[PDB]
Amino acid sequence: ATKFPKFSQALAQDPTTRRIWFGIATAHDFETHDGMTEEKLYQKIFASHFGHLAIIFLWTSGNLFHVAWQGNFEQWVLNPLKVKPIAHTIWDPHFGEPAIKAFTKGGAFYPVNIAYSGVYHWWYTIGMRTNNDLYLGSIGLIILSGLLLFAGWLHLQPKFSPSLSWFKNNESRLNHHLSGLFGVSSLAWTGHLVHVAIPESRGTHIGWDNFLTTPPHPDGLAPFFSGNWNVYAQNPDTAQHIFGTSQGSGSAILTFLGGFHPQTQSLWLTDMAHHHLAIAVIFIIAGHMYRTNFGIGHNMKEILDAHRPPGGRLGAGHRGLFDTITNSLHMQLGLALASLGVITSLTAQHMYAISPYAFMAKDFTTQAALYTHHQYIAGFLMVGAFAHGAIFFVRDYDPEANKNNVLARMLEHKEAIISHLSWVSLFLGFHTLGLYIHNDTVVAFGQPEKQILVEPVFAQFIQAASGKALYGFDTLLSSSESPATVAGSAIWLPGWLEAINSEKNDLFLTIGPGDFLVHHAIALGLHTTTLILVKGALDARGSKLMPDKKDFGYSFPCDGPGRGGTCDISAWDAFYLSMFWMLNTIGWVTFYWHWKHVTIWQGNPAQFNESSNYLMGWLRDYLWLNSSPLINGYNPYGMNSLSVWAWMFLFGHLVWATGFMFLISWRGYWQELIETLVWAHERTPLANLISWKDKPVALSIVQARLVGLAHFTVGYILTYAAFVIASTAGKFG
Amino acid sequence: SVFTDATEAFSKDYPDFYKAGWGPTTKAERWNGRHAMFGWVLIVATGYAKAHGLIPDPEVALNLKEWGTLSILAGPQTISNERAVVLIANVHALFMSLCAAFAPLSFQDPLLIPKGQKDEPAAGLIPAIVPGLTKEAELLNGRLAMLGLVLVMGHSLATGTPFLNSVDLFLGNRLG
Amino acid sequence: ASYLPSILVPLVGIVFPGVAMALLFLYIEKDDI
C-alpha cells in the first residue's frame, strides 16, 4: 500500500516515474511480491489461469459472433473457391469515399475485411454450415467464459482455496490431464467427427435437434460390440465425391485411406476420426500409469531416483530431480514452453504439407499467414523456455540437493558445451555465408556455371524412402521389392503414394541446391540462438567476471565499468540478445517458405531453383519483385484494397527503426537532457502552476533495452505480416 | 435486509465508487429518476412530433457530403433524418448536463457526493408520503418513471412493436 | 444490427479509453491505498 504498486514497498517509495514503469513490469512476478507465501502464490497462479482461459474463450466467441453477424459464411460454403471469406465490417469515420468503395468486397453492402485466419475452412470442415450454428457456438463459448470467470473467483474463497499439497499432487494431475484432458477430449472430438462432421460432409444435416435419432452408421454399434469393426471401414467415399453433398458419398466412419480428398485436396474426415479415436485410446491407457490412492501405479520419485547407470558416466543419475521439478515453477514452466514451441513448429510444418481443412491450400494467403504465425509463436515459446530455465538456475536451483546430479553435471562441463556450440555456429556461418557470397560473385561476373551447387542428397533420400519416385533412388517405399512397401501396400500405401508423387501438393516439395543452402542457414540460426540462450542459462549463476552473479538476481543492468566493463552481463541480457537471433532465424525460415510457395503457385518453380543460390537473387526476385503490389497500395493515382497493408508496412518499418533509438543510445544522455527539460518547465510562467507529481527520469537501462527490443519485434512482425499478406493477396501468389 | 446486504456488498467491493456516490446509492437513484422523468416527457413529445410530422420523417436521409462520414451507417446507407433530429434534441440536454455537472449552481444538488458529506439515508420500499415539491415526491415519481420505461421497453421487445408504437397503444391511442 | 457499430465504436475507442485512463491516473497517484 501507500502508493500504486502494493506488491513492492521499494517501488512504492520511489518518487520518480520509474515507480509507474516497474509497477507494470513486476505485476505478474508473484514470487517477488512482498509478504508472498508458497500457498498464496499457487492459488493466485490458479486464479490467473482461470482468467486466461476465460479470455481465450471470449476471443473465440468474438470470432464466431463476428463471422456469423457480419461474415458471408453461407455464401462462402456455397462457393468456397471464388468468394473471399469476411472477417468483420470496417466502421472507420476517418475513411474517405474512395476508401469505402475500395474496401467493399465479398458480399458487399458495407466495408469489410477479408479474413486470412482460415477459420472459414476449419468451421466448414468440422461440419458447420449456417450462421445460426456459428451464433450458437459463440453463445456457448460466452457462457463457458462466464463460468470460468466464476470458477476463478470461487477458488479464491477461503473455504474453496485448494491446499498446497493439492497443487503438488503430480501423479493425479498427470493421470487426469493425460487420460481426461487429452484422451477423453480426443474421444469426444472423434465422436463429434463421426456424428456431425462426416454426415455434414455427406450432405446430411445433423444438429442438436436430430442427432439422438439418426445413428452415424446404419449398423449402429452392433459391429462395435460384436467385434466386426471392419464394418466401419467398408464403403468409403469414392474419389468422385463432392464434399458437402451426397454425390458419390459413402458410409464408412473409420478408414485408413491416406492421401487427400480429391475434390477438397485435404485429409479424409474418416481418416481424422480414426486418428483421433486411436489417439484417445492411447492417451486413456497412458493416463493409468501413476498411482493415485488406488495401490496400483508408478511413483515418479522412485523412477527418477532409480535411473542412474552403473557405469557412472552420468554420476548420480537423475537423483533429486523430482524435488527440483516439483518445487520449482520456473523449471516446469520452461519445460512446458519448450514442448509447446516444438509442437507449434510441428503444426506449422505439417498443416502446410498435410492439408487438414477442406478447400485450404487454394487460399494461399491463409496458408502463408498460418505458417508464419505459428512459426513466430514457436520461436517466442522456445526463447521463453530458455529464459525461464535461466530464471530457474538463478533462483530455484539448489546445488546441495543436486550433488553429482545430471543437472549439476550440466553446469560442471558448461565450458565444453558453450565452446563446441560456438564452434558449430562459427563453422556453419563461415561456410554458408562463404558459399552464398561465392555464388553471388561468380554470377555477378557472368559465370553462373562456376557456382557451388550442392545437391541435398540426404533430404532427397528421405523423400524417396517415403515413396518419392522422382530422384531414382529405389530405396524402401520407392522400390517395389522391399518389405516396407509390401507390408504397407494393403492399408495406406496406395493413397499416400498417389499423394506424394503428385506434384500438385505440398507433400515433400522437390528440393535442390537452394533448399540445401537455406537449410544450412536455418541450422546456423538455430545453433546460434541456442548458443546464446544456453550460455545465458549456464552462466546465470556466475562467471569469472561475476563469480557471484546469482546474488544480483536474474535481471540487473550491469556490474559497473570496473574490471573491463560488464554491459549486458546478466542472464536477462542473454535472453534479450537471443531474441534478435530468434527473430532473424524465424525470418529466414518464413522467407524460405514464402518464396518457395510463391514460385510454385505462380507456376514457375524454376525461378527459385535458379535464384536461391545467391543472395542478390533473394534481394531481387523475392523482396524487390513481390513488394510491387504492396507499395502500390496507395499512389497519387488512387488507392485499392491493399492500402491498409501498405500503411501497416510503413508503420512496421517506423516501429522497427524506433527500436534502434532505445537499443543504440543509452540512458546517461537522456537523463542529462531531461534535467534541462525539468529546468525549462520549472522556469516558465503560466506553466509553473501545473507541476508533475512523479519526478520525470530517463528509462532505466534494463527497461530501455526491453522497450527497444519490444519496438524492434513489433515493427519486425508488423512489416513482415503486411508483406506476406499483401504480396500474396495482390498477385494471388 | 436483502437490499441492505447487496448495498453493503457493493460498498465492500468498490469503496471508492460507493463513497463518491457511483453505484447503488440514493443520489444515483434520484439522478436516474429525474432523467427518466424527463425521458418520459421527451418520448411523449417524440410521439407527438412523429404524429404531426414535425420530425423530417424517415423518407429523407442525410447527405453524405454535407454531414461527412459520421452520417454513414454501414456503407452507402446514411442515418435517417428523424434519428438525427432526436439525437440532436438529446444533444441539447447532454450539453446542458455537462455544463451543470462541472459547474453546478450553488443551491443545486451536486452530481457526486461532496468529499466531506455522505449519501443520504435510504428511502425504503414505500418512501415517506408527502405531497408538493418535496424530495420524497420527486424520488417516488422518479422510481415510477424508471419502472415504466423498463416495462414499456419490455413490452416493445417481447411483442416486437416499436417502443413509440407501444407507447401509442397505451394512453388512449392519442399519439403515434 | 447495422446501427450498433456507430454507437459502440466511439464508446470503445474514445469514451472507454478516456474514462479508463482517467481512473488509472487517479489511482496511480492516489497516494493512499
Binding site: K6, F7, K44, A47, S48, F50, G51, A54, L58, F65, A68, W69, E74, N131, N132, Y135, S138, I139, I142, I143, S145, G146, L149, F150, G152, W153, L156 | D13, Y14, L157 | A1, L4
Partner: peptide, 30 residues
C-alpha cells in the same frame, strides 16, 4: 442473418460475463 434479438441476448450474456470478470479481478486483490 442473426436477428436483433440474437445480438441483444449475446450482448446481455457478454455483460454478465463482464461483471463476473470485474468480480474475479477484484478478488485477485492487488
Amino acid at each position: 442473418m442473426v436477428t436483433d434479438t440474437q445480438v441483444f441476448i449475446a450482448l446481455v450474456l457478454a455483460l454478465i460475463s463482464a461483471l463476473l470478470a470485474i468480480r474475479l479481478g477484484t478478488k485477485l486483490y492487488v
